Design a protein around this ligand. Structure first.
Ligand SMILES: C=C1[C@H](O)CC(=C/C=C2\CCC[C@]3(C)[C@@H]([C@H](C)[C@@H](CCCC)CCC(=O)c4ccc[nH]4)CC[C@@H]23)C[C@H]1O
Lengths: 231, 10
């Protein structure tokens, strides 16, 4: 049985997501334009990423119990989560027809060769596409989508966390909501091992994040916020 | 170290 507090936590996260993700993609007009030379797509995706960092921050703030953390713990959690939660969010625009991210128009349909033109090797792109395909194949309810983003953000084992017990306590509450959700609301055969498969997607994102942490004249073409978050 | 991050939070 899903408790009242649990459905409230879902209701919150759905709304929080609605406010931080605009599926019209109308703000994309404001970015430096996409040019399709080396790194011709870098400015445009760096802006997208920057804009997306902001949205993730808006979303995080609405996670129940996140405001109860110190501003330091909030800051480190978002520093580490940003890129993961972006790859997550992006599943919404991602389509398996093309294996591309389709954001309403040709100019904003981003394929492997676009990501490449932002200066990225197949070493990152490939784990990244396998991830989007795997996640799409899960076929999450929008409820499970937002819980997974929340859970991803509020992880006690991220570098720089002071009060892990509190981070952990906030997270536990979300996972329990998700686990109880799946039982009560996800029917079979989709429900099969869907929690352990989701937690796996969380491990694939940590890797992607760490591989990205490894991968000056390019640092200029990024944004202030992006440089602040990725160092 | 993180003024823009802390601004978007507060
Ligand atoms: C509004 C949204 C979401 O916020 C994000 C979105 C698409 C996201 C995409 C599709 C295009 C390429 C994106 C932005 C990826 C980056 C290129 C990312 C590569 C993978 C790292 C593991 C690198 C991030 C990065 O450091 C960078 C990008 C450009 C310059 N520097 C990360 C996630 C990828 C459209 C839409 O669904």
């Amino acid at each position: 049985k899903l408790s009242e507090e649990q459905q409230h936590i879902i209701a919150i996260l759905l709304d929080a997501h609605h406010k931080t993700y605009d599926p019209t993609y109308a703000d994309f007009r404001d970015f430096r334009p996409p040019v399709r030379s080396p790194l011709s797509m870098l400015p445009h995706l760096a802006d997208l990423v920057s804009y997306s960092i902001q949205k993730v921050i808006g979303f995080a703030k609405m996670i129940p119990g996140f405001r109860d953390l110190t501003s330091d713990d909030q800051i480190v959690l978002l520093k580490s989560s940003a890129i993961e939660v972006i790859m997550l969010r992006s599943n919404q625009s991602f389509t398996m027809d093309d294996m591309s991210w389709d954001c309403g128009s040709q100019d904003y349909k981003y394929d492997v060769t676009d990501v490449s033109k932002a200066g990225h090797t197949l070493e990152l792109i490939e784990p990244l596409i396998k991830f989007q395909v795997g996640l799409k194949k899960l076929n999450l309810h929008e409820e499970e989508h937002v819980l997974l983003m929340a859970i991803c953000i509020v992880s006690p084992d991220r570098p720089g966390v002071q009060d892990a017990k509190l981070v952990e306590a906030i997270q536990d509450r979300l996972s329990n909501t998700l686990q109880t959700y799946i039982r009560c609301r996800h029917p079979p055969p989709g429900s099969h091992q869907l929690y352990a498969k989701m937690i796996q997607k969380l491990a694939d994102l940590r890797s992607l994040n760490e591989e990205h942490s490894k991968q000056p004249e390019n640092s200029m073409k990024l944004t202030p916020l992006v440089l602040e978050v990725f160092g | 170290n993180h003024p823009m991050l802390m601004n978007l939070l507060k």
